[PDB]
Symmetry: C3
Subunit: 102 residues, 3 copies
């Protein structure tokens, strides 16, 4: 509350997203080595992580929608970028597994 | 410019870009069916939908360029991330549709 | 930090990441032409440019972390989105170049 709380939220998204991101990179490394089983399971481990971050964002979006004021701050922005850009990396990774497999 | 006008601009962006994004996954789904012409086309629908969000974003910063003050808000950050992340997913999808066609 | 400084910073990020994005697209065009040499090289130039953008974002974050106040403006959000989607886009591309080869 409030500035400290938002800093914690920001960091929750960033730690968890950064985790998701190298897990998505592990998955890329696997498909590189024709090992699709590893790539696929890593693709789901990154999901596990990524939604911890997603939920953090959602809870933050929920507080705003309801009226409690949230003053942005560059670390929030950077966090959000990191979630959403990691989500999109993973969306790409999935689709690329599918070409790989042929 | 007022908090309500901005909230609207946001959901607009989020709404149109969410829609463009599902459309891009439709084009992905089509590259999986080997429907390379469907996919080509959905990438165009997606583009028609995105230009909407995109236009909204560009007017907001145009409005900002011209001196109007815009307090941020987490849903705007989130709207911009949707547009820019959706746009980039689409760029990936164009490139991957080429790859598929080989 | 400091309106003039933050607008400068934001434009530095947008211009350099904009350039890195076009170079990444060069790498995609060069992939498409079967030319894996150029594409690999272009992915490194894109990186040379992106780095300038990442540095400026890092200085801002590090400034923020040291207690300096920073009112984010849409232009900054937009610049950060350009940096982080452009990074994500290089990342896919590095992978896609790999797949082009296989």
């Amino acid at each position: 509350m409030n500035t400290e709380e938002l800093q914690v939220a920001a960091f929750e998204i960033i730690l968890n997203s950064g985790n998701a991101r190298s897990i998505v990179h592990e998955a890329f490394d696997a498909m590189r080595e024709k090992n699709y089983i590893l790539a696929e399971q890593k693709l789901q481990e990154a999901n596990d992580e990524l939604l911890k971050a997603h939920q953090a964002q959602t809870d933050l979006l929920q507080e705003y929608a309801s009226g409690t004021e949230i003053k942005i701050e560059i670390i929030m922005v950077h966090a959000q970028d990191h979630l959403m850009t990691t989500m999109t990396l993973r969306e790409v990774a999935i689709e690329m597994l599918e070409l790989y497999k042929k």
